[PDB]
């Protein structure tokens, strides 16, 4: 509702918001956002049409991003600087208030987590891969569960124990056969899934 240069001056300092752990971040269709960018001439180089109404973004629409419209589950292979564009918390609330959203939609929150095999770094966790899970007794049966990178193997172990009718008293071993031919065996029950470096959609079996 305020002026175009009010809006532009307000979201200007969104840039400095470094990605931080336990950080809440969201998804916006780049197509909508680029239109808004043009609308307030956020990019200094492009401000010709200014706040002229033809350029008006309207209510936020991210329908294109979802795979199933009803379930609101997102599409695969979505990239950062082309198909969407990330956004801080307060930047949502402001941009929520000003434009609203298409009915039947809910904000696509996600949070950054620390990942990177060698050099550690911050990136918004998305497209986590339903890791394949299995049991020693049934080689055919495979479950595919989602695991955050911040999630520790212990959390992973706990979730494995819950779905294969196994209680606490008996011990357990976990192993990873990833691009190695040989069967390794997982040792640490404290670290994350990242410092272990497990690959997406792969049979971690107990």
């Amino acid at each position: 509702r305020p002026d175009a240069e009010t809006q532009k001056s307000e979201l200007g300092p969104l840039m400095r918001t470094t990605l931080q752990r336990g950080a809440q971040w969201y998804l916006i269709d780049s197509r909508w956002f680029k239109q808004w960018k043009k609308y307030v001439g956020f990019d200094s180089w492009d401000m010709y049409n200014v706040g002229e109404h033809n350029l008006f973004p309207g209510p936020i629409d991210n329908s294109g991003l979802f795979s199933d419209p009803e379930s609101q589950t997102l599409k695969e292979h979505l990239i950062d600087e082309l198909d969407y564009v990330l956004v801080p918390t307060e930047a949502w609330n402001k941009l929520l208030n000003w434009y609203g959203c298409v009915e039947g939609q809910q904000p696509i929150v996600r949070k950054v987590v620390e990942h990177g095999l060698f050099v550690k770094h911050c990136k918004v966790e998305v497209y986590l891969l339903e890791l394949k899970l299995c049991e020693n007794s049934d080689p055919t049966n495979v479950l595919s569960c989602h695991f955050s990178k911040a999630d520790t193997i212990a959390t992973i172990e706990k979730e494995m124990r819950k779905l294969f009718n196994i209680p606490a008293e008996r011990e357990t071993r976990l192993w990873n056969k990833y691009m190695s031919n040989t069967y390794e065996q997982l040792s640490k029950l404290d670290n994350t899934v990242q410092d272990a470096g497990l690959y997406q959609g792969q049979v971690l079996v107990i």
Partner: protein, 308 residues
């Protein structure tokens, strides 16, 4: 003017170049070596009219010798500096010896020195990409020349310039291009040490004050099998030491000591030195424990070689 002196001084010049004129005549079909001696001589006198002439004379019989185009084209760029002339010679070098990237890269710098329009510089680069080169390294060199050019168009003072986005778009475009087209034709990556990613990381961390992007890039460099190199980690460390914090240096160095395969001792001394100058006593002790452990295993493996 008093002719006869103009006639006499012109005769002294004729006598001076005469031994060279005869050696060129008695020699072989390209007499390229004889041309080089003639060119060297003409460069000592430093007369612009004669240097163009002698070069042009040599290029008549040796138009396929890239080293000759380079010396000629470089000369115009260092001495004469005439737009219409220097650009004409670069363009002529590419058409005669397209397989050499230097002729192309020097063409793009020279176009830049003479304030050629961005659109015209850009379309030339695209032609370079369709030119036929022999090494994978050649393709990274052309890309690097173009990326530097794009960088010099950016005003880094400003947080968000378009030219900066053009630079960043080119970078994305360059790495994907190196991975698919150069790997496809050569069946080896064209950038083993990820020098393009390195440059992008340096730019992104020093000039645009973007350390997170710098880190993901360095992680990717290490992922590509560069983690075993001591000097490679030190490049990352040195980048972090300047625009990152101490906390990130310590973890990296902790990572470096563990992964380094060529000179682990070098990174250990560097880790210990940092803690000595900046770390707490506990930070230091941990460093000594980890270095002792890594170093114990390395000397052990050396021992295994011998036993085995």
């Amino acid at each position: 003017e008093s002719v006869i002196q103009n006639y006499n001084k012109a005769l002294q010049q004729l006598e001076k170049y005469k031994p060279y004129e005869e050696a060129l005549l008695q020699a072989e079909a390209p007499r390229l070596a004889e041309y080089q001696a003639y060119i060297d001589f003409e460069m000592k006198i430093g007369d612009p009219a004669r240097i163009q002439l002698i070069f042009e004379r040599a290029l008549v019989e040796n138009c396929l010798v890239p080293d000759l185009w380079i010396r000629y084209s470089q000369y115009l760029d260092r001495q004469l500096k005439v737009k219409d002339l220097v650009l004409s010679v670069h363009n002529r070098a590419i058409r005669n010896c397209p397989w050499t990237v230097a002729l192309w890269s020097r063409y793009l710098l020279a176009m830049e020195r003479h304030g050629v329009d961005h659109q015209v510089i850009s379309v030339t680069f695209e032609k370079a990409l369709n030119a036929g080169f022999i090494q994978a390294t050649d393709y990274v060199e052309i890309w690097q020349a173009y990326l530097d050019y794009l960088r010099r168009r950016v005003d880094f003072k400003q947080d968000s310039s378009k030219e900066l986005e053009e630079l960043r778009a080119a970078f994305t475009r360059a790495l994907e291009y190196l991975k698919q087209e150069v790997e496809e034709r050569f069946n080896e990556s064209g950038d083993p040490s990820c020098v393009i990613m390195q440059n992008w990381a340096r730019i992104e961390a020093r000039l645009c004050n973007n350390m997170q992007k710098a880190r993901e890039l360095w992680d990717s460099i290490m992922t590509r099998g560069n983690a075993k190199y001591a000097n490679m980690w030190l490049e990352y460390y040195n980048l972090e030491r300047a625009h990152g914090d101490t906390q990130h240096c310590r973890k990296a160095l902790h990572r470096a000591v563990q992964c380094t395969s060529d000179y682990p001792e070098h990174v250990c001394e560097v880790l210990l030195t940092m803690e000595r100058t900046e770390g707490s006593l506990e930070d230091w002790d941990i460093a000594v424990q980890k270095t002792e452990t890594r170093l114990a295993r390395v000397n052990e493996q050396r021992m295994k070689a011998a036993e085995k």
